[PDB]
């Protein structure tokens, strides 16, 4: 009867920035004890419902999204915050009410040589509306010259890698970010706590 949080929060692999695996979870009892205690949670900031009173209100339908972010720009994950991660590959709607979680992680997110498997979007024809997947590698064209479909003098591949290293610094190191979104009154509450 317990929610499959262990099936989302804890895992060995994750999408980089754009293949974020949106998992919808319902028909459960919501527990906000392990999350509330924070423990190793780097930043438990939540936009919308207060974090203290989460286990009181019965939500309708809840989604979990996960990805990895560079960290110096973790703040970009919030309503009405432009940038490069919040504007091209993961857009949060204005009326967002859920919570955002960030875990500091170097032990499991950086090989000795340096990870190159955390691609994130770099260019796009138009800004991305909230909550829209973007999984496609079609070469961009900065200039007027059409480069066809290989590359060009003003054409780039729209997926660059973070370039992680074990040392890096206090910033510029992988932060695993997971955001929970709640629907307001779609139907009678389906998940609630004790």
């Amino acid at each position, epitope marked *: 009867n317990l929610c499959p949080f262990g099936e989302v929060f804890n895992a060995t692999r994750f999408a980089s920035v754009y293949a974020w695996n949106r998992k919808r979870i319902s028909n459960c009892v919501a527990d906000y004890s392990v999350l509330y205690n924070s423990a190793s949670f780097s930043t438990f900031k939540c936009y919308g419902v207060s974090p203290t009173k989460l286990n009181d209100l019965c939500f309708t339908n809840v989604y979990a999204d996960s990805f990895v972010i560079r960290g110096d720009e973790v703040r970009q994950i919030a309503p009405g915050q432009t940038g490069k991660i919040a504007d091209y590959n993961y857009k949060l709607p204005d009326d967002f009410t859920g919570c955002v979680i960030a875990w500091n992680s170097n032990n499991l997110d950086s090989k000795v*040589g*340096g990870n*190159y498997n955390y*691609l994130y979007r*770099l260019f796009r024809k138009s800004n991305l509306k909230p909550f829209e997947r973007d999984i496609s*590698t*079609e*070469i961009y064209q900065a200039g007027s010259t059409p*480069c*066809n*479909g*290989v*590359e*060009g*003098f003003n054409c*780039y*591949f729209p*997926l*660059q*890698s973070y*370039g992680f*290293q074990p040392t890096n610094g206090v910033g510029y190191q992988p932060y695993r970010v997971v955001v929970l979104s709640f629907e307001l009154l779609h139907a009678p509450a389906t998940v609630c706590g004790p």
Partner: antibody
Amino acid sequence: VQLVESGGGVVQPGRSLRLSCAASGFTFSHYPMHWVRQAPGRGLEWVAVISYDGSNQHYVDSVKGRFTISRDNSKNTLYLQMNSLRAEDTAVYFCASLITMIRGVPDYWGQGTLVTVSS
Amino acid sequence: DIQMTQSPSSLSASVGDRVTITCRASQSISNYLNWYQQKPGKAPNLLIFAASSLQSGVPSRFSGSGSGTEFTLTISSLQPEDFAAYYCLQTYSTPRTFGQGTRLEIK
């Protein structure tokens, strides 16, 4: 993460030869792919490139028409068909992916495939 | 369409920290380049990323600057395990013609 190639040999001047390039590890359906030629005891030249969807086929202005290249994402392979070959084609072919301005696409090459058409 | 030339094409490098390779293009390339290495009978691997950027997996000795129409790779040591090809490659247009090649001696 690796990639290998097969289909080489020695044949008469002028015939249909199909060679395959199979790559595992890095996802194959996201990046273009290039074929590069190296003649023995000389530099190396470029022949052709294929995009991710296999809709565009750019070639060098030396084997235009003779060569053809396609991809099979489900099989996760690159197929190069060369026909009406001539003597100078004798060389070693490499199946590669080449970076242009960003560190996104990897740069693995395999080993190569020798093909001489003296017969 | 685009044709390249690297002047030396052959050099002798005894004990010394000053070995350089010059690469030149017919048309203004800006800062689009690649410099690759090829050991005798081995698959070539990267040596320089683009114009003046390195690629993780090689020491910091290798260097290269200059954009537009002239390019110069330079090294600052010997480490007698890098005597191999120093090929030059373009990333400007679809022709993408390579260079000629180079060889390193032992004196």
